[PDB]
């Protein structure tokens, strides 16, 4: 191994609501050391929240953070 | 549950060297939702590491911080 000696964002909950893509700042997926791989939605306050690719508007802003 | 939709710190890797605790802002346990229960140490660069209980240094800060 290299040098991961720091935590691991993984996330298992998932909020049914929709967040604010005015406070969106930048999200990441998480997994590997994790029960279940979920996305996570990272506002201005770095506040990490728990979104999963099964809902329809959590893909909406994976779809437009990651635009082409 | 009640509202627990946030990213786990989960941290499972141990530095073998010790931190300044210069930088040491403030540290924290993880477990539960993680491989295996460990600490944290936070410096003021939102830098999260991680530490084993098990060091000689390690519990010098864990001690040094939850002072009497």
Same mark, same amino acid.
């Given at each position: 191994?290299? !040098?991961?000696?720091? @935590? @691991?964002? #993984? #996330?298992? =909950? !998932?909020? =049914? %609501? $929709?967040? $604010? %893509? =005015?406070?969106?700042? &930048? *999200?990441? *997926? @998480?997994?590997?050391? #994790?029960? /279940? $791989? +979920?996305?996570?939605?990272?506002? %201005?306050? /770095?506040?990490?929240? #728990? +979104? /999963? $690719?099964?809902?329809?508007?959590? %893909? &909406? *802003?994976? /779809?437009?953070?990651?635009?082409?």
């Amino acid at each position: 191994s290299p !040098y991961s000696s720091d @935590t @691991t964002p #993984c #996330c298992f =909950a !998932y909020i =049914a %609501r $929709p967040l $604010p %893509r =005015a406070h969106i700042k &930048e *999200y990441f *997926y @998480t997994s590997g050391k #994790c029960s /279940n $791989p +979920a996305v996570v939605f990272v506002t %201005r306050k /770095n506040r990490q929240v #728990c +979104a /999963n $690719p099964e809902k329809k508007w959590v %893909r &909406e *802003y994976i /779809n437009s953070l990651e635009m082409s």
